[PDB]
Amino acid sequence: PIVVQAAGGRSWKAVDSVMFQQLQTVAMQHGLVSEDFERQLAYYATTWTSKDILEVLAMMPGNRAQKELIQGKLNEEAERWRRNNPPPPAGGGLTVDQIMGVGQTNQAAAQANMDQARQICLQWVINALRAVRHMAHRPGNPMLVKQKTNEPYEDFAARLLEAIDAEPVTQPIKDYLKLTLSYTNASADCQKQMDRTLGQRVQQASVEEKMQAC
Amino acid sequence: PIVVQAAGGRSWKAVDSVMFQQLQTVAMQHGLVSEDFERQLAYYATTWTSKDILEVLAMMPGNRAQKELIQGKLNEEAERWRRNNPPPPAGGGLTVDQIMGVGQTNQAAAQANMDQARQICLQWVINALRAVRHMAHRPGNPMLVKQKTNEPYEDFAARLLEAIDAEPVTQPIKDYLKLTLSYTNASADCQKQMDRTLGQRVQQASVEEKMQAC
Amino acid sequence: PIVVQAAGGRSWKAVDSVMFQQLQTVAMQHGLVSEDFERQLAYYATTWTSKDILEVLAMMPGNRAQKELIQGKLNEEAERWRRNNPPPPAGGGLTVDQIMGVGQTNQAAAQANMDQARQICLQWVINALRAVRHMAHRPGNPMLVKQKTNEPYEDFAARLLEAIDAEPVTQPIKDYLKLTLSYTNASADCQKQMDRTLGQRVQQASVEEKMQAC
Amino acid sequence: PIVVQAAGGRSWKAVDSVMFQQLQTVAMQHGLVSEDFERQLAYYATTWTSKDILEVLAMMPGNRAQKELIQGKLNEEAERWRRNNPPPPAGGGLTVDQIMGVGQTNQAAAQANMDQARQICLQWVINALRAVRHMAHRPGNPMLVKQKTNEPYEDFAARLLEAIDAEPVTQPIKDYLKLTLSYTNASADCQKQMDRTLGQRVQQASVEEKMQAC
Amino acid sequence: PIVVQAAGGRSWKAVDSVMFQQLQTVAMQHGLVSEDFERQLAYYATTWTSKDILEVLAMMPGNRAQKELIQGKLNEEAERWRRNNPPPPAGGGLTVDQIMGVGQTNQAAAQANMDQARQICLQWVINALRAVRHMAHRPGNPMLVKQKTNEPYEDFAARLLEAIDAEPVTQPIKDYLKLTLSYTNASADCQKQMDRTLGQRVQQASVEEKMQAC
Amino acid sequence: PIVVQAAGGRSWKAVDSVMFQQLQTVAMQHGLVSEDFERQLAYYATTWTSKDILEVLAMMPGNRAQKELIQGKLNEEAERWRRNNPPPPAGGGLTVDQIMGVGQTNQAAAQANMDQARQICLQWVINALRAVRHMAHRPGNPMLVKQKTNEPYEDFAARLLEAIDAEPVTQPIKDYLKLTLSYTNASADCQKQMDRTLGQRVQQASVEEKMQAC
């Protein structure tokens, strides 16, 4: 974390044991790659220095094969950033090193010059966790989801909505799935009940309207 | 949360892990849509910035079908606010975006300019949670409640009072129900005991007076 | 709670999660109406603003029939206060509204003008909890208490002393009960042992002197 | 507790929930009258105002017969103090009321004028707890203690030392007991072993020297 | 820990019980020599004075044979440092004593003069823990690892990656192992599946590409 | 504990409940006389005033026979200090009373004049705990230790190293034991394996070298 001193200069402070434990328990209960960990990480990582975002991620509980993958993606995110942007002549303001906090004192990766590098690092870590999560799902998962025999639509909606979230497809194509796949994937019995209540709203009806049926 | 610095300027601070856990456990023990979560949220969310009210709600434990509904209602609350009020020419002081903290640094959604947007956001979240809760109950629930055979009136009162609370009907019509439905719903045996003790106070007697019987 | 800033102006702060949990656990372990909750509430509620005394009571764990009664009494306490005191012309310094923190920002129910209203509110809540507790006991409970066959006098004293506490009768009439009922309620076997050891101190002997017997 | 503000004026603060729980658990695990509670109370009660020493004692877990006795003794301690000292003309600097914090705002029982009353109150509470503890033991307990058949001397020493502590006899007469009763109470088998090893040190040997035997 | 006072002078503060417990639990759950303990130690030990790095390591939970080894290595690290660097004439700026905080007040091992000694001490402790860990593994562990019959490649990757980490061989030779040993160690059935999917990428394919197979 | 105020004057503060619990749990899990308690006590007792070192030791969990012994030794440590040093004429700067904090306000045993007395008190308490621990072990314990039949050398090393630690013999004579007793105490089977691998290093080999065998 970074503490902004009264004068205006900034100093480094270690992640507060409590916050470290909170992120740890969430990773242990769910997954380091899980969406939950990503959510809490982003909210509390604003203050975290680029080096901390990488040390307090490597202390979190997970498999060693998984950690290699999370570091595989953080590398491809870095190489992309190096490519997407031509270095400015003289090598520019920033480097993947500065961003990943390589060879920097913990009180210099928390100075004002590293605010931008600090944000880009967290951006990559969240993207890396999402990438490992996305691959963990074979494509077509919303298509694969089918309302289980005699299972509440709520349960089907929860599987289907997560499956649509699992896909990295843009929000608009995700929306289409919520409208189209829900009715189709819906088990025939709910689908017949939806057809009578929804009527023409076969795709028009929202998932909530579909939830009203069965 | 927002911290008001001595000078008067305001800065952003993350929800204190302890408070986050307290809201989380309450949601896990009851429901994110449950009244309990709504109560603690409102008391502790005053300081919370509009963005936090939306991030610290999405980290709370609940079903994914339920979260879609809570976001369904927050949308209809926003569209209503956009409709109820004509935008002032030049688009006015505020936008649903400013209110929902869209594209704002966490240290700018906590400045004095966003006090009003901060309150309107929480207003919508509490209303959204109530709406999901209300629909979860089919209308006529107080009418549906009937003192269970050989069950304490206290237990009946607890079901009936919550059922009256479940209805979004104004407080005065809710009061009428406490006076009228209680005696009628009351099982014949308590109802006969209430008739002799209450006498003319068949609807006049308060639920507490009815509690004295059986 | 209210924080007195150095300048002298006051600002509002939410009940510290820890203190909220401490009151909550006590209510869950005992009762919201229980004496224990009343004791801790009074000690820690001094700082609490009138609004908090009512929000941090409604979040505490209890039955919904019970909460109606606690709000029934807080109403009769308010109507009494409205009656006991004629409003001063112009409606006076205070109103039940100001006292119950109705339509007040949480940073204005904590200003110096609301110190008096803040205390009167807590006074009513403690009285309300006591009233629900008192009614929960049918009158004559000390008279009803009888030393159980072959039960330590200590156990009898604990039941009888609480029964005398349950009665809202003034402290002096409560004292008489400790002196008179104890010996009479005492089971014949202890009562015979008390008669020989106490001698003339049949009512003169304190409960502690009676405790020495059996 | 009392907080000494920078200027020098003092203000009242509630016992920190953590410290309250620590004293509570100790009382629940041992006893409110137990020595353990008395030890922690004295160390942490220095700051506590006279009123707090009486409110944070009445919230602690114990039987209601026991609490009457603890209040019985606090009364006889007060009447003694009222007797032991003639009131100075005009009624003097202090009163049992000021000492027991009767009719005083919690921010006035923590001002410098009440430092002396604050200490005298705690003095009485510790003495009161000791008195209830002492009576709980019939006199002659060290004499009653006898090394149990085939029980470690350590276990005997622990019972005997507590029994000597239970007696309110001055420290010097307590010491004599550690030297005399130990050997006599010691079971014949250890006593024979002590006689050969201790030799003339039958009373001369300390309990530690006796511990070396069996 | 070291606290930098406003003036600029530094003072000593004990490791915060919470942080001590966090390191302790991690050591108890894993090992004092375990990598996990090393990670958290390095992140939180920056502030720790050289003396604390040695006292808060000796209080951590572990076997006494293990602690001798951790102190064996810290000695050979010190003798190396004494050798690697000739002492400057007059014995130079620093000594293994100053580094290991020998005969220094806890408020002088935290002054600015001991920043360098403070870092060198932690450097040795982390190296010492790694050395005990490395020896605990017989050389050739990656070679020893063989994908267990009918075990997920993920599980094999986790064993193999840790085995490659166990070896103190430079990062580049470790990388070669991830590319070469993985396919060879891979059980014939996965190895055949890898051969068809990987094709020429027998060593070219990354562990993640190998993970895609079985 | 002692708090150094900005001006420079010092004030007393009670041991932070958390730190008290941490020392308590360690004593309960191990022993008040155990080495573990001694380690944490020394690190956290620097700030503690002489009176606290004696009150926060008497509240710790242990047998009453044990506490008498810990107070037996603290007395012989004091009498030694009184003897070892002639009192300076006028009775000198210090007294065992000042050191043991006898008849001193808790805000005067924490002033700068009592820094020296504060350290000497803790010195005695640690020595007292060690003395009780040492006697608890009959002399010759390292000689007594013999590698248990079919038990890892590690387990033998752990028993032997603690046994060498149990002895209060100077560090150099303790070292000789680690070199000599280890091989001799080692069970014949490990001893034969050590003889072949160690060769001439029968006493030359360190315990770690011996650990490599069996």
Separation of alpha carbons D39 and F50, rounded Å: 16
Taking each helix axis as running N to C, give the angle between helix E50-58 and helix E115-135, from 0 to 180 degrees, rounded to the nearest 10.
Answer: 30
Give the residue from F42, F2, F14 showing the smallest Cα distance to F128. F42
| DSSP 8-state symbol, D87 | P
HEC string of chain E equals CEEECCCCCEEECCCCHHHHHHHHHHHHHCCCCCHHHHHHHHHHCCCCCHHHHHHHHHCCCCCHHHHHHHHHHHHHHHHHHHHHCCCCHHHCCCCHHHHHCCCCCCCCCCCHHHHHHHHHHHHHHHHHHHHHHHHCCCCCHHHHCCCCCCCCHHHHHHHHHHHHHHCCCCHHHHHHHHHHHHHHHCCHHHHHHHHHHHCCHHHHCCHHHHHHCC
Name chain B's partners: 3 or more CB pairs within 8 A. A, C
Separation of alpha carbons F41 and F125, rounded Å: 9
Give the end-to-end CA distance of chain C in Å, rounded to a whole number.
49
Which structure tokens are listed for D102?
A: 């009767």
Helix (H) or strand (E) holding A93: none
Q: Are the C-beta atoms of B177 and B142 separated by less than 8 Å? A: yes
Full DSSP string of chain B:
-EEE-TTS-EEE-PPPHHHHHHHHHHHHHS-SSSHHHHHHHHHHTTTS-HHHHHHHHHTS---HHHHHHHHHHHHHHHHHHHHHSPPPGGG-S--HHHHHT-S--TTTTTSGGGHHHHHHHHHHHHHHHHHHHHHTS-TTHHHH--PPTT--HHHHHHHHHHHHHHS-S-HHHHHHHHHHHHHHHS-HHHHHHHHHHHTTHHHHS-HHHHHH--
Give the residue from A193, A170, A178 showing the smallest Cα distance to A142. A178
- In this structure, how many other beta carbons lie within 10 angstroms of the beta carbon of residue B85? 10
Which structure tokens are listed for B13?
A: 């601070």
Which residues of chain A make contact with E40, given a CB cutoff of 8 A? 59
The partner residues of C2 in beta bridges, in order of sequence, read C12
Which structure tokens are listed for D155?
A: 């276990």
Give the residue from C212, C17, C33 showing the smallest Cα distance to C125. C33
With CB atoms and an 8 Å threshold, state whether C65 touches B211. Answer: yes
With CB atoms and an 8 Å threshold, state whether B18 touches C18. Answer: yes
Of D55, D56, D65, the CB nearest to C154: D65
Q: Quick one: closest CA in A to E209, which residue?
A: A69
Separation of alpha carbons D114 and F182, rounded Å: 66
| DSSP 8-state symbol, C16 | P
Of B58, B63, B68, the CB nearest to A39: B58
On whether any CB of chain F is under 8 Å from the CB of E77, the answer is no
Range D141-212 has CATH code 1.10.1200.30:
yes
Summarize chain D as % helix, strand, coil (round to 5): 65, 5, 30
Separation of alpha carbons F29 and F40, rounded Å: 13
Name chain A's partners: 3 or more CB pairs within 8 A. B, E
Work out the minimum CA distance from A67 to partner chain E, whole angstroms: 9
Q: Quick one: closest CA in F to E72, which residue?
A: F208
Contacts of C88-94 spanning 24+ positions with Cβ under 8 A: C94/C120
Separation of alpha carbons A128 and A70, rounded Å: 6
Which residues of chain A make contact with B18, given a CB cutoff of 8 A? 18
Cα–Cα distances in Å, from E203 out to B138, C18, E180? 63, 57, 5
With CB atoms and an 8 Å threshold, state whether E64 touches F161. Answer: yes
With CB atoms and an 8 Å threshold, state whether F18 touches E17. Answer: yes
Give the residue from C185, C139, C135 showing the smallest Cα distance to C160. C185
Q: Where are the domains of chain A?
A: 2-135, 141-212
How many secondary structure helices (H) and strands (E) does chain F include?
A: 12, 2
Separation of alpha carbons F163 and F141, rounded Å: 6
Task: State the Rg of chain C over Cα.
Answer: 22
With CB atoms and an 8 Å threshold, state whether F18 touches D18. Answer: yes
Of E44, E161, E165, the CB nearest to A65: E161
Of E63, E72, E106, the CB nearest to F208: E72
Separation of alpha carbons F155 and F210, rounded Å: 12
Separation of alpha carbons B139 and B132, rounded Å: 13
Separation of alpha carbons A58 and A76, rounded Å: 18
On whether any CB of chain E is under 8 Å from the CB of A4, the answer is no
Separation of alpha carbons A12 and A52, rounded Å: 10
- In this structure, how many other beta carbons lie within 10 angstroms of the beta carbon of residue E132? 20
| Residue F2 neighbours by CB under 8 Å, 6+ apart | F10, F11, F12, F13, F47, F48, F49, F110, F118
Separation of alpha carbons D123 and D109, rounded Å: 16
Architecture label for domain C2-135: Orthogonal Bundle (1.10)
Of C55, C63, C64, the CB nearest to B43: C55
The partner residues of E3 in beta bridges, in order of sequence, read E11
- In this structure, how many other beta carbons lie within 10 angstroms of the beta carbon of residue F106? 19
On whether any CB of chain E is under 8 Å from the CB of F116, the answer is no
Give the residue from B59, B32, B43, B30 showing the smallest Cα distance to B130. B32
On whether any CB of chain A is under 8 Å from the CB of E35, the answer is no
On whether any CB of chain C is under 8 Å from the CB of D14, the answer is yes
Half-sphere exposure for C90 (CA within 13 Å, toward CB): 2
- Output the CA torsion E85→E91→E97→E99 (10° steps): -50
Which structure tokens are listed for E202?
A: 């027998």
Q: Which of residues 127-186 of D touch C (CB under 8 A)?
A: none
Separation of alpha carbons A172 and A152, rounded Å: 26
Q: Are the C-beta atoms of E57 and F146 separated by less than 8 Å? A: no
- Backbone dihedral angles phi then psi of residue D122, each to the nearest 5 degrees: -60, -45
Which structure tokens are listed for B88?
A: 């002032």
Cα A71 versus chain centre, distance: 15
**SS3 of residue D192 by DSSP:** helix
Cα–Cα distances in Å, from B72 out to D199, E178, F49? 91, 48, 61
On whether any CB of chain A is under 8 Å from the CB of B106, the answer is yes
Range list of β-strands (E), chain D: 2-4, 10-12
Give the residue from F56, F69, F68 showing the smallest Cα distance to F27. F56
Cα–Cα distances in Å, from D52 out to C20, C47, D104, D174? 19, 15, 12, 34
Cα B39 versus chain centre, distance: 7
Work out the minimum CA distance from B69 to partner chain C, whole angstroms: 25
Separation of alpha carbons C40 and C32, rounded Å: 11
Method of determination used here: cryo-EM
Give the end-to-end CA distance of chain B in Å, rounded to a whole number.
49
**SS3 of residue F12 by DSSP:** strand
With CB atoms and an 8 Å threshold, state whether B56 touches A46. Answer: no
Which structure tokens are listed for A197?
A: 């209540």
Range list of β-strands (E), A1-142: 2-4, 10-12
Cα–Cα distances in Å, from F84 out to F50, F78, F114? 21, 10, 20
The partner residues of E210 in beta bridges, in order of sequence, read none
The experimental resolution of this structure, in angstroms, equals 3.0
Which structure tokens are listed for A201?
A: 């709203």
Q: Quick one: closest CA in F to E20, which residue?
A: F22
With CB atoms and an 8 Å threshold, state whether F157 touches E18. Answer: no
On whether any CB of chain B is under 8 Å from the CB of C68, the answer is yes
Q: Are the C-beta atoms of F182 and F210 separated by less than 8 Å? A: yes
